[PDB]
């Protein structure tokens, strides 16, 4: 059967032929409660006390109990289980290349990494998730060290020189849709380039970047206060008023694409994709494949980062204290296996339940390449050139750039829009809203005794009235 | 897109790695999340707590 | 008076998110429930449901 399946596209032997042969069969949960499963065929080929002589079925591979997102974790059986859960959560937030035809699509939110790499340390289950063809992350030289104190409490130090070379650079694509609509006979929204002495209630912005069809052109730089779609609605000397589509605030970028079409009911429909390049920043979220999330705390240049005797600086420095309470030992084994993989010129195997891969075997393989067998290296201080007294664990580890950039979250309000009903500030950074000084904050300021600050927050920084 | 080779999908500006399994409703891709339910036509006997029933069979 | 969230907008941030959202199961027990038994990883989930992939928080 194995020999016939080795030539699947020659013999026309398939999985369905293997089912028809009486070799495999589908067992559901009710039937599984009556079967006797051998975990491996080693449970079958067992001596006088096999613990069971009446095995009815055998697992094809135990690592198939994982899902799509848990199958990208290297050495998942060397990690604490909540960390595998956290990586299963964060692998859906990792930016790579989400689909091949992303240039055709205008999704509302899109995220494309410049240089996604397949992991040096993969699982075999990843061969069917197409993670080799659409990867989300970069193999990074990670040194686990305390350097200048800027990686503490789940933070990373990044190499600024690496970042300048395109390390974890991404593209954010945002699509804006608008359409003319005939909401009544007299009402007629239309894509026109508006004129100041003709349109009612403009938002004091520039309109020169619009073409005379009312739509901005691809390749044009745009900023937060810029018009990209000029739509005017006829008012039943200001015969029409401004209902133009504006770019979202503080989201600078470049118009990548403009598409004009007809909707279902036959009106003009425009979709504009704006492209913005996201260079890695302090406060951007990065995660390894083991639940080791963390924001970038600082970025040092190559001459400031610690270096090995070969001149290798880490791309990312993570804190040692991220490891002990977490017990993400699979992170350390992935780093060691990735050092071995990058030296040997091969892709390391990190299928969960594999006795062919062992920490001692990886250590001996690493020592065969002129490195210390436990992955430590003598690092030198970047600032002074002196050897660090401790020897630093350093090697390639697969990291992921998560969707949570700080520039999509930074928000301040001095004064601005307020709600109609309660005359309090608005909701969210998208509406220039205020932050909620909630009930718990009120209790905390009661316990502080700061009554005038409590009055400022709850009366005259929110909604004074007489 | 049924039965099309990867070259035909690329000529239609579709990703051959795209799995399908979703709908396009007003241009938005919608996936139907599978929903768990109790199995039908099966007798299940439980013990309701703090109630007038010591045991209850349900089908 | 109808169940919500059966149809969801398909996640397209990563190919892994697309696959995970296309293979997603849902217990329609209210997330305000504070009993642990439907949220527990049952023994009978071996090989059927991933033991690691679950959301964090109310779900």
């Amino acid at each position: 059967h194995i020999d016939q399946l080795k030539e699947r596209e020659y013999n026309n032997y398939s999985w369905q032929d293997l089912v028809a042969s009486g070799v495999v069969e589908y067992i559901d949960t009710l039937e599984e409660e009556t079967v006797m499963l051998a975990m491996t065929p080693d449970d079958l080929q067992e001596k006088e006390v096999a613990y069971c002589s009446t095995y009815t079925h055998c697992e094809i591979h135990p690592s198939m109990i994982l899902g799509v997102c848990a199958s990208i974790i290297p050495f998942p059986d060397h990690n604490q289980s909540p960390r595998n859960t956290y990586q299963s959560a964060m692998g859906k937030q990792a930016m790579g290349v989400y689909i091949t035809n992303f240039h055709v699509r205008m999704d509302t939110l899109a995220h494309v990494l410049y240089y996604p790499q397949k992991p040096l340390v993969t699982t075999r289950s990843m061969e069917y998730l197409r993670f080799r063809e659409l990867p989300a992350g970069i193999n990074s030289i990670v040194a686990i060290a305390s350097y200048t104190g800027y990686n503490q409490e789940d933070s990373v130090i990044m190499n600024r020189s690496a970042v300048d070379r395109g390390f974890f650079r991404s593209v954010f694509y945002r699509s804006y849709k608008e359409q003319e609509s005939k909401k009544g006979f007299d009402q007629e929204e239309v894509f026109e380039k508006p004129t100041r002495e003709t349109c009612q209630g403009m938002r004091h912005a520039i309109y020169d970047k619009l073409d005379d069809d009312g739509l901005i052109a691809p390749g044009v730089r745009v900023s937060g206060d810029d018009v990209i779609i000029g739509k005017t609605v006829t008012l039943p000397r200001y015969t029409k008023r401004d209902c133009s589509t504006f770019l979202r605030t503080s989201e600078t970028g470049i118009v990548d694409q403009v598409m004009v079409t007809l909707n279902q009911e036959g009106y003009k429909f425009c979709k504009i994709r704006v492209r913005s390049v996201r260079i890695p920043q302090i406060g951007d979220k990065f995660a390894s494949r083991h639940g080791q999330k963390g924001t970038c705390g600082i970025q040092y240049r190559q001459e400031d980062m610690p270096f090995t005797c070969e001149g290798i600086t880490p791309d990312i420095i993570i804190n040692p204290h991220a490891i002990p309470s977490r017990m993400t030992i699979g992170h350390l084994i992935e780093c060691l296996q990735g050092k071995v993989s990058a030296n040997k010129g091969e892709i390391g195997d990190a299928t969960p339940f594999n006795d062919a891969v062992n920490v001692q075997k990886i250590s001996n393989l690493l020592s065969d390449y002129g490195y210390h067998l436990r992955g430590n290296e003598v690092l030198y201080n970047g600032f002074t050139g002196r050897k660090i007294t401790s020897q630093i664990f350093i090697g390639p580890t697969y990291y992921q750039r998560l969707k949570h950039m700080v520039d999509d979250k930074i928000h301040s309000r001095a004064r601005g829009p307020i709600q109609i009903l309660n005359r309090q500030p608005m909701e969210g950074r998208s509406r220039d809203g205020g932050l909620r000084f909630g009930e718990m904050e009120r209790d905390c300021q009661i316990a502080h005794g700061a009554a005038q600050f409590l009055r400022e927050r709850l009366f005259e920084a929110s909604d004074p009235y007489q | 897109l049924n039965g099309l080779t990867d070259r035909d999908l690329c000529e239609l500006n579709e990703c051959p790695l795209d799995p399908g399994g979703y709908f396009i409703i007003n241009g938005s891709e919608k996936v139907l999340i599978a929903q768990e339910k109790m199995a039908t036509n099966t007798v299940y006997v439980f013990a309701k707590k703090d109630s007038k029933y010591a045991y209850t069979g349900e089908c | 008076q109808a169940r919500a969230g059966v149809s969801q907008v398909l996640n397209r941030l990563t190919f892994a998110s697309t696959l995970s959202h296309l293979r997603r199961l849902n217990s329609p027990i209210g997330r305000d429930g504070k009993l642990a038994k439907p949220r527990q990883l049952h023994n009978t989930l071996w090989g059927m449901v991933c033991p690691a992939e679950t959301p964090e928080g109310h779900a």
């Binding site: 080795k6 065929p41 289950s125 | 799995p19 | 296309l22």
Partner: peptide, 29 residues
């Protein structure tokens, strides 16, 4: 002939590759 334990890993990932060549990942939908 029986699959030897030294060939078992390669054989089991062959049959897993055959399963995912036929069914894929969204076969249930």
């Amino acid at each position: 002939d029986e699959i030897t334990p030294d060939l078992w890993q390669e054989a089991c990932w062959i049959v897993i590759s055959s399963y995912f060549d036929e069914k894929g990942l969204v076969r249930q939908q």
